[PDB]
Amino acid sequence: SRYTTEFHELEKIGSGEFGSVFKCVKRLDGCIYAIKRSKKPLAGSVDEQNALREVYAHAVLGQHSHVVRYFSAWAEDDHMLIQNEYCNGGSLADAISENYRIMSYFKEAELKDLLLQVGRGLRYIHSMSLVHMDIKPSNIFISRTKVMFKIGDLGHVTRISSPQVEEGDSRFLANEVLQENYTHLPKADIFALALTVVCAAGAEPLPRNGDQWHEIRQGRLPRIPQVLSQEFTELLKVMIHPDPERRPSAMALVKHSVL
């Protein structure tokens, strides 16, 4: 077993239907990695393409400061394994939970930094003719040393020129994707990112469906309890515009003075 021989498990850091994720030391270099171990996907199943595309996405994207770095992927004993960098801050979902626990919140300066950093990650992914298609807090990872946000969980990644859309989290999904219009997919990542930042800013849990879900897709920004500058508010708002073409690209996004 490569997993057993090459790596020492330190802590279970994730669990789900796929399998489990462990914080591990690689014995050879002594460094810490996040290693996901998943069962074999069933024949002709969505979980199949998902796990397959994760590795391809990592392969194309390779090393970038705002994308979770891939180190290797292999299979043995009827499981798939992928070895990625370990982000010691967990995900943005974990960070938001910690804020809830201590009743703290991300200030505007921190929200701008989150938006700019993940924005730079998207700009890179989009420049390689790919889209992420599952941006949300739980897929944004955090490295502290101060803080670096890195786009992770690349299982929904697809090409803009031959789009294969697996329906993502309904809470973050732009209306035109639901309508099976895949002609503006990078703008779907932009929509999702805005709502990710809105979650980080202290908004109530986003709706999965219903009237509140539609209000957002009509371009109405969810309520944010803390005071934010008008220019920052207006940027988040145009990022969720009903017309994808009115949403800024990632390139246009990161070139906002406000950030």
Ligand SMILES: C=CCn1c(=O)c2cnc(Nc3ccc(N4CCN(C)CC4)cc3)nc2n1-c1cccc(C(C)(C)O)n1
């Ligand atoms: C290789 C698997 C995907 N993945 C990464 O690429 C990755 C990179 N860094 C980390 N760091 C990480 C994650 C979680 C936590 N904590 C979570 C909450 N606990 C209370 C304490 C530990 C502390 C540090 N975690 C990472 N991954 C990870 C870890 C858990 C769950 C998931 C899924 C696949 C659900 O997205 N992914």
